[PDB]
Design brief:
- The structure is cut from a larger assembly and holds one copy of chain A (268 residues) and three copies of chain B.
- Chain A contains two helices and 21 strands.
- Chain A has helices at residues 2-23, 234-265; strands at residues 34-39, 57-63, 71-73, 79-83, 87-91, 100-103, 106-107, 109-110, 116-117, 123-128, 138-143, 149-150, 153-160, 165-170, 175-181, 183-185, 193-194, 199-201, 210-212, 221-224, 226-228.
- Chain A starts with a helix and ends with a helix.
- Chain B has 262 residues and is an alpha+beta fold.
- Chain B is 23% helix and 31% strand.
- Chain B is built from two helices and 19 strands.
- In chain B, a hairpin with a 5-residue loop joins strand 7 and strand 8.
- In chain B, helix 1 (3-27) runs antiparallel to helix 2 (227-261).
- Classes of the chains: A alpha+beta (268), B alpha+beta (262).
- Chains A and B meet through helix 1, strand 1, strand 2 and helix 2 of A and helix 1, strand 4, strand 15 and helix 2 of B.
- Chains B, D: Pfam families: Flg_bb_rod, Flg_bbr_C, LlgE_F_G_D1.
- Chains B, D: This is Flagellar basal-body rod protein FlgG.
- Chains B, D: One of its GO terms (biological process) is bacterial-type flagellum-dependent swarming motility.
């Protein structure tokens, strides 16, 4: 009877994973999941080896499919997106940016202190560059600050180029580079452990974080005015709902048959 | 106590093994690269009461002798190693073997295990491993950190593209192993097989030469279980199970009657 | 030759309710039949005491 | 009278305990912050008729001995303290722990009980109390009558908003307690727990530091019961229950037969 319950457990896990994907059809930066199953074959020294009925179906791993999601256009300079491979670096505490998590949604804004933060008031991290210098001076990530006054002159517009550099223009007609958004990549994206709010953290199965600039090396570009929706396909998810129910029903029939066998002997 | 009690006991055991095999097939109806199994039935030895062919008078032999069977058993659980359908996926690291062949991985004890499941991934070092227990793939395929995309050729050559460099760099070469009798493999779980005596020697080569199958990138091989056949066989095995219990029920009632009478 | 450890998995009992119940059928019947012999011997000894 | 009668009696009681535990999970299928329970079976002692490994002669010891079991019993009822799903509600006085932790309430006797149920309310004095019997939450969180909107932070900082006054006015700080072994907690009813010897010392701290969970306002934690698992297990336990009744029924018939023959 446990083999049938293994099928029911495997099928219900498939339903729960698909239902999770459908629920997050509108969350920004969501990466869908796929339930992977494996076989069970246990034998001992005293077990016959010629006939080997399986032990059922085992859950192998709930994958974290990381393909690029479709982009929405909001015409908002504070909404960002990574076109390619990479995640944004976001720290919950401004003082300590080492305790940071990886995210894919770029819905940012300015706090009351003019720090570019997420919806959860978590500070975005970036590289510190001199106003006159070019490339990154010190590679250590720091929270991104866009001053209201620089000189003086009051902030007028903020825009991001393909290199991720945040540029703020002021009343005095002075364009000052205030930094560039840091991009993080890992050798294994599916090894990242999932936190809340469409955010990940580094693990040992995912390797170490790779800090780099946008449009440099293996990293992608940064586009402002765009957001990335969920990377799920509604038709595929709805169909997977169909196939998973007809596998819970088939397995439940096997569970029903096994019970009726035991009832048959109990009436002798 | 009664000969029919033991014969029907073997009948119940045989159908339980058959139903257990069918129930396992239904459980793995979504397992990638799973091969369905069917039970093989055979009759046990026959007790020799009257010898067929015995010389019952000169020039006259017993046309049919009194030979009572001992029941039946499931002698083998034969794996049906036919190809499954292809699932089109967007992942760049899940592969399919189009035709005969098996992916080879390194088991923790040091031996090489052979699998049909193509759901692969990477570890922290970039080595191509499985998406389950993370077994390394033989031969090791290390994806460099400078790669922007991964392409797996039909011939198994794994190449990646590096920024600012045309003519994508080859980072590995996959090899797949075929068996003369893949049904003789020992399933050790986790979608893995081990070679046995009846399986034959593992013959290795490039995936696409010497009769080996091709490697299909971004494609998965579905299980070959036919739920329609599994459910119908489930009903038939249940009927044979219940009619064997009727013999036991009849034998039990006979013994109860005799004890009260004799 | 040692077995492997499988996390998030349990080893169910290996008892076969089909075999145990049929064995119960055999055990009950053989138990009753051996009681028939003792009852038969009991009647035999009663007959001898009354006759002899 | 018969060894099988007592062994199967322990089997019947073990399954009755198992079904009672299963029925409890189904009854609390909509209770907020309820952790399902699982019965743990283990066999009783074995009578030592023949010692396994004892000497049958020199250079020959008994390979297997005659050891009769005494039945089985449910030795523990373990709470599966896994996190449940989060329900979004419009109420502002019901909170949830996202992660490890337990809310603290003051019992009538003066002790502190730990609850995963976050459905709170106010009494006439405005103190934040549970929505059931009304046990105040430790430490006291009294809402002033001038409040127009109540917000509870992720770090447990409770604050209100006042008309004609910018910046939320802080009114209190929530603290939650964790345990090394929450399965050792004593269920005392009313969605309340108590610390025990096997639970471990209570460790209190800010909700969000030192591994504690975070307070989610306007969100409730559903029960982790899976009716699919409970119903399937209840069918299995029912079959095992009828297995031990067949043994008792057969034993009774044997004693009836002996009472008439012997």
């Amino acid at each position: 009877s446990y083999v049938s319950l293994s099928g029911l457990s495997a099928a219900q896990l498939d339903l729960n994973t698909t239902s999770n994907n459908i629920a997050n059809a509108n969350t920004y930066g969501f990466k869908e999941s796929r339930a992977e199953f494996a076989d069970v074959y246990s034998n001992s020294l005293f077990t016959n080896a010629k006939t080997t009925p399986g032990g059922g179906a085992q859950a192998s791993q709930v994958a974290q499919q990381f393909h690029e999601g479709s982009s929405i256009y909001t015409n908002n300079p504070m909404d960002l997106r990574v076109s390619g491979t990479g995640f944004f670096a976001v720290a919950k505490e401004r003082l300590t940016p080492q305790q940071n998590e990886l995210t894919r949604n770029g819905a940012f804004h300015l706090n009351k202190e003019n720090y570019m933060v997420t919806a959860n008031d978590e500070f975005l991290l970036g590289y510190q560059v001199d106003p006159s210098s070019g490339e990154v001076s010190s590679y250590e990530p720091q929270p991104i600050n866009i001053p209201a006054e620089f000189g003086t002159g009051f902030l007028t517009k903020v825009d991001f180029d393909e290199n991720g550099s945040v540029m703020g223009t002021y009343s005095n007609g002075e364009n000052v580079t205030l930094g560039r958004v840091a991009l993080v990549r890992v050798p294994n994206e599916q090894g990242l452990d999932k936190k809340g709010g469409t955010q990940w953290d580094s693990t040992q199965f995912s390797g170490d974080k790779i800090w780099g600039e946008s449009n440099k090396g293996s990293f992608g570009t940064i586009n402002n005015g765009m957001l990335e929706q969920s990377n799920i396909d509604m038709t595929q998810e709805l169909v997977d709902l169909i196939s998973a129910q007809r596998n819970f029903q088939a397995n439940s029939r096997s569970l029903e048959v096994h019970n009726q066998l035991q009832q048959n002997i109990l009436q002798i | 106590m009664h000969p029919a009690l033991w014969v029907s006991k073997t009948g119940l055991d045989a159908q339980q093994t058959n139903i257990a095999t069918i129930s396992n097939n239904l459980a793995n109806a979504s397992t990638v690269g799973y091969k369905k199994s069917r039970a093989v039935f055979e009759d046990l030895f026959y007790q020799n009461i009257n010898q067929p062919g015995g010389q019952s008078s000169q020039n006259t032999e017993l046309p049919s002798g009194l030979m009572l069977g001992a029941g039946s058993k499931v002698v083998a659980t034969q794996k049906v190693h036919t190809h499954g359908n292809a699932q089109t996926t967007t992942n760049a690291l899940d592969m399919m073997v189009e035709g005969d062949g098996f992916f080879q991985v390194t088991l923790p004890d040091g031996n090489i295990g052979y699998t049909r499941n193509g759901q692969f991934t990477l570890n922290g070092e970039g080595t191509l491993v499985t998406s389950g227990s993370g077994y390394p793939v033989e031969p090791e395929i290390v994806i460099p950190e400078d790669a922007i995309s991964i392409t797996v050729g039909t011939d198994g050559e794994v190449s990646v593209r590096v920024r600012g460099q045309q003519d994508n760099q080859v980072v590995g070469q996959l090899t797949i192993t075929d068996f003369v009798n893949p049904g003789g493999l020992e399933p050790i779980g986790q979608n893995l097989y081990l070679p046995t005596g009846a399986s034959g020697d593992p013959q290795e080569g490039v995936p696409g030469l010497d009769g080996l199958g091709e490697i299909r990138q971004s494609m998965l091989e579905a299980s070959n279980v036919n739920v329609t056949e599994e459910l119908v066989n489930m009903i038939e095995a249940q009927r044979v199970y219940e009619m064997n219990s009727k013999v036991i029920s009849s034998v039990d009632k006979m013994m109860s009657f005799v004890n009260q009478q004799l």
